[PDB]
Amino acid sequence: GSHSMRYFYTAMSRPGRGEPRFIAVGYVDDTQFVRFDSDAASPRMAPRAPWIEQEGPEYWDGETRNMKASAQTYRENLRIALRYYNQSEAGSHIIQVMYGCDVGPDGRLLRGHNQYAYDGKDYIALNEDLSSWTAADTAAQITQRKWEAARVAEQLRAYLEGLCVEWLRRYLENGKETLQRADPPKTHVTHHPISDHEATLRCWALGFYPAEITLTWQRDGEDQTQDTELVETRPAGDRTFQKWAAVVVPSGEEQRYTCHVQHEGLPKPLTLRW
């Protein structure tokens, strides 16, 4: 996988507090580039990356039109879902959608995606064939039947093989300075005594892009998988990410431990010691 484009929609009902909220975000790789929020004073598809700003008003109007229409449709989907699960109109529920395309270094489609969740649980997904569906439950089977009847998969396929890949390629070119630049992690090991007998070694990775990274501690060359505390990769707020991995070690055994760092921005994996 060289690059991806993904759109994420969340539709959230809130009975008694107006119509369900609809929020959409678009990403290329780990870079957000657009958003829409139906609760905004003036809802529009709005830029979130500099390289998208150059798109003309027909782009922005068209995306806004789409997001408004999408909000209406997902409000209706929330109503339908209530019926499919025999649920009360008094509770709050959420539909999420993810879709997009992955392309190789040559820009050809590697694979397409279109998945839905209801209340945080898988609902229905387009299969890798971009032709058939996997329904999670008997409610989603009803949708599957309707979508098989309407040849919905063919529509997604046409988008995923066509416009998705074409627009992704455009974005990758317009944003080439950043979207096509890996920033390797800045790495170091810190040492924190806990007692006379043990200390924590923490291996840091900072300022990296994209988010994908592997940090592993070895003791005498053996992966310490079960004994390593690994925090979730976290955004720094400047486009880059941070992560650490820690192990508790016997005092005076520090040199038996090595931190190993793999990242796409590194020509070779790194080995660090305290």
Binding site: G26, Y84, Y99, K146, Q155, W167
Partner: peptide, 11 residues
């Protein structure tokens, strides 16, 4: 650019 079907699929 977002997916924009003539008819947006309903559940």
């Amino acid at each position: 650019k977002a997916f924009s079907p003539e008819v947006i699929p309903m559940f």
